[PDB]
Ligand binder design. Structure first.
Ligand SMILES: *C(=O)N1C[C@H](NOS(=O)(=O)O)CC[C@H]1C(N)=O
Ligand SMILES: *C(=O)N1C[C@H](NOS(=O)(=O)O)CC[C@H]1C(N)=O
Ligand SMILES: [Cl-]
Lengths: 241, 241
C-alpha cells in the first residue's frame, strides 16, 4: 500500500544553501499524505514561541477576554525594542506584528486553570503549561512537534477544535498572510532561542497543503529564512509558482 | 465646514489615460468621509451584474441553501464559453471565477419570495427582483449605485446586515482578492452590457477604505481596467504603494 508519510531529503539543499538545518513538513489534504525532509525532527517537540498566539487567540476569543477582532488593546506606554509594538493594536495587528505584551495580557486574564484545560481540550502538544502563565510558550514547559502543529492546524481548518466556530473563523482571518490569484497563505511565525518556526497552510482552488517548519535559529538575523526556505520547498513541489 | 462627500476630478486623468469614462468612489472609514471624481455618476444606479454574487452568497448561506464554503456544487455538464465554469465549484471558487450558473442555482433554491424579502432587509439598491429570480441581476430590473454599494459593503464589514454573523464572515472570506504586508483587498468584479464594476474595500493596519467603481465597457476588451484604474486612484491617494 501507499505510504502516509514519505521522506524527501532533496529539500535539505534549501537548508544547506543558507548554512542552516531544520525540517519542513507538508500535508496534502486531498491525498491524505505527508512529506518531510527529516522524519525524526518532524516529530521532535520544541517550544512553540509565537506560534502559540494561534491557540492563545482562540482561547481568549472563546472566553470573551477578546470580544472581537476590532477590540483595541491600548499600548501600555512602555517603549519596547520592536517599534511596531509601541502602539495600540487589535487582534489582527497583534497577530501581524506578533505583539507579545498584548498576548501576555490575554494569558493573564485566561489564567492557569482555564489555559491548561483548553490546551488539554485542544490536544495541543504536550498540554503542559508549567512555568509562567504569561510566558510558558517562550520559556516554560510546553512543547509541540511540527507534525503536532499540522494536526492542530487541520482541526482549526475544519472547525474541529473545542471552541466555537466563530472563534476559529476569526483566528483564521487573523492568520491571513498572503493572497493572490494563485494561492492564499494563512500562517504564523515564531522564534525562541535556538528555533524558528513557520506553521500554517496554503489554500489552492482544489486542495490545501498544510505546512510546519522549524529550523535552528542562532540569530534573529535570517528570520526571513523561515518563509524563504519553506517557499523554496513549496516551489519545488509545484504548490506555488 | 467639511462635507460628507468631496469631488476630486483629478482622478479623471486615470480614465482619460485609458480613453474611458467612469466613476471611482472611496469612503475613508476612520474619517467618515467620501471622495469621488463624479458625484452624479456615483449616485447613478446600474445593473449589479456579478457584484450581486455578494448578497446572493449571503442569502444562500443564511437560508442553508449553501451549507458552508466547502460544499461542492457539481458542474451540470453543459459546456459554456468560460472554461473555468465547466467544472465543480464551491462558494470560494464560484466567487473567484464568477460562476454565474452556480449562482443561478442558488437563486432558484432561495426562490423569489425569500430573495425579495432579503434584499428589502438589506436595503439593497432598488430592491426590484422583477424578471426571473435567476437572472434579474443580469437582465432584469434591479439597479444599484456606487454609493449604494458602499453603504451595503459598510454594513457587511460591520456585520450589520440582517443575516447571521457567520454568513457575513464567510462571504467576506470568499471576497478575499489580494493580501500582503501592506494591505488586504476584499472585492468583487462585475460586467453587464456596457458597464464594468469593481466594489469592495482595502484593509490597512489602522483604517479601511471602501471603494466602488464603474466604467463604460463597450467591448469585453479592457475588463482589466476596472482594477487598474481603481488602483491608480488608490496609489495617488497613498492608500496602497
Ligand atoms: C514569538 O515567537 N516572538 C514574538 C516576536 N515574533 O517575531 S516572529 O513572529 O517574526 O518570530 C519576536 C520573536 C519572538 C519573541 N522574541 O518573543
Ligand atoms: C459578472 O458580472 N459576470 C460573470 C463573469 N465575471 O466576469 S468579471 O467578474 O470578471 O466581471 C463574466 C462577466 C459577467 C457575465 N457575463 O455574466
Ligand atoms: Cl480571510
Amino acid at each position: 500500500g501507499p505510504k502516509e508519510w514519505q521522506e524527501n531529503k532533496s529539500w535539505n539543499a534549501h537548508f544547506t544553501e543558507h548554512k542552516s538545518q531544520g525540517v519542513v513538513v507538508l500535508w496534502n489534504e486531498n491525498k491524505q499524505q505527508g512529506f518531510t525532509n527529516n522524519l525524526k525532527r518532524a516529530n521532535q517537540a520544541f517550544l512553540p514561541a509565537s506560534t502559540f498566539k494561534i491557540p492563545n487567540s482562540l482561547i481568549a476569543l472563546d472566553l470573551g477576554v477578546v470580544k472581537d477582532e476590532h477590540q483595541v488593546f491600548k499600548w501600555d506606554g512602555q517603549t519596547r525594542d520592536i517599534a511596531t509594538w509601541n502602539r495600540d493594536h487589535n487582534l489582527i495587528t497583534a497577530m501581524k506584528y506578533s505583539v507579545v505584551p498584548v498576548y501576555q495580557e490575554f494569558a493573564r486574564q485566561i489564567g492557569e486553570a482555564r489555559m491548561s484545560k483548553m490546551l488539554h481540550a485542544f490536544d495541543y502538544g504536550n498540554e503542559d503549561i508549567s512555568g509562567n502563565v504569561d510566558s510558558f510558550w517562550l520559556d516554560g514547559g510546553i512543547r509541540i512537534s511540527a507534525t503536532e502543529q499540522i494536526s492542530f492546524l487541520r482541526k482549526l481548518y475544519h472547525n474541529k477544535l473545542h471552541v466555537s466556530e466563530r472563534s476559529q473563523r476569526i483566528v483564521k482571518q487573523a492568520m491571513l498572510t498572503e493572497a493572490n490569484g494563485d494561492y492564499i497563505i494563512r500562517a504564523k511565525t515564531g522564534y525562541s532561542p535556538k528555533i524558528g518556526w513557520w506553521v500554517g497552510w496554503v489554500e489552492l482552488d482544489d486542495n490545501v497543503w498544510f505546512f510546519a517548519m522549524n529550523m535552528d535559529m542562532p540569530t534573529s538575523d535570517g528570520l526571513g529564512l523561515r518563509q524563504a526556505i519553506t517557499k523554496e520547498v513549496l516551489k519545488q513541489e509545484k504548490i506555488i509558482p
